[PDB]
Every structure is written in C-alpha cells, then in structure tokens.
Design a protein around this ligand. Sequence first.
Ligand SMILES: Nc1ncnc2c1ncn2[C@@H]1O[C@H](COP(=O)(O)OP(=O)(O)O)[C@@H](O)[C@H]1O
Length: 205
Amino acid sequence: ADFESLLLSRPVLEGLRAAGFERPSPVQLKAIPLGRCGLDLIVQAKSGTGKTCVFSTIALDSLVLENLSTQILILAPTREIAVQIHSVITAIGIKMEGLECHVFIGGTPLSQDKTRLKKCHIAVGSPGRIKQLIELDYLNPGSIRLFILDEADKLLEEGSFQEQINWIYSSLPASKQMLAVSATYPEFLANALTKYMRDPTFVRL
Ligand SMILES: Nc1ncnc2c1ncn2[C@@H]1O[C@H](COP(=O)(O)OP(=O)(O)O)[C@@H](O)[C@H]1O
C-alpha cells in the first residue's frame, strides 16, 4: 500500500516523495490513519522503524497552514533530537509555502525566542525551555491541538522531565490530541502516560 491509500493531503504527499520517502513503512501504514482520526496514540517500536517520520507526517497533515499560530508542540529529550525533528518536518514540509517550524532550546536569549514565536506553526523543544516560554506567555498554548512526545521513555524516566511535562500538559487546552512514540514501554512509562491519555490506541509491529 502507498501513501495515497492513507488519505494524506497533496502537499504532504509531494513533500514525502521529495524528501525520499517513496512508500510507507509498516509502522507508518498503521499509525498515520489512526493519527489522522484524532486518536491519542502510543507507538512502541524499535529504533529505525520510522516513528519520527510518523509523527512528523501526522503533524504536517493536521496543520492549518493559513493560520499562523502554534498548533503543534513537540518535545524531545535532548537538543540534538529536537533539531533532528526540525530537519524531518522541514524536509517533508518543503512543499508547504510559509511553514514555520522552530526549535526552542537553552542558550538562545529568551527575547529572540519571543520574536520567533510570533510566526510559528510547530514548536519543537526541550521541556525546560518550553515550560519557561509558556510561563512567560511567549508561547501562548491556546491554539495547540496536537502535543507530541518523542522518545517518551527517555522523557519520562527517573531523573528526566516528568514534572515539566505534567506542567506543560496542564497548561494546554482541554481538547487536544496526544501522540507518544517510544522504543520501549516499561511500567514507569505506562504509568506516566495515564496522566495524559484516557484511553490510548496502541500501535506496535
Ligand atoms: N517511508 C520511509 N521510506 C524510506 N526511508 C524512511 C521512511 N521512513 C523513515 N525513513 C528513514 O528511516 C530512518 C529511520 O526513521 P525514523 O523516523 O528516524 O525512525 P525512528 O524514529 O523509529 O528511529 C531514517 O533514516 C528515515 O529517514
């Protein structure tokens, strides 16, 4: 089956092909329609199966491009992974004129993040910086409808970002979709995600 059978919009289809993604991987076949349906997803599959591309594709297909507002928030456990996500979104979104996707990490002045957030469809960042930006109302979360956790195991493990993610989650609108993707699903992650997803759909190979 091809990407067309997944009912993606033409700009996303064209972007996928331009970015070198000719046919969906098994996890993409399963997860993309469920993502388009608006369901909360837990996608658990090993590294390299295509999970980053899954959520990036669901995200881009969901965007109202003509509304220059932050509709999608994506968290990553490291600065490098935040940038990797940005690279994937920018590649697949290459046919979407005026797409604004930006990375929010430590080391840039907050005043510059403030300016960048005035033109930002998709915010990608680390939990600490994103929390700070929401607290300052530099990122007003009122237009966010899709909240994505990449490497959710690493995000929510002991000594990581559960407190900040709980806080961010609570700041978001009541009505929203969440996606969590992870290589593993240990008890701590199963338990943590009950805070955010009432009755998630699981996607596994
Ligand atoms: N449909 C596809 N066709 C070809 N290559 C793909 C496809 N989806 C992902 N890839 C590539 O496979 C690798 C792993 O994808 P990624 O989305 O990073 O997986 P994960 O997040 O599960 O580790 C990357 O190099 C990515 O560019």
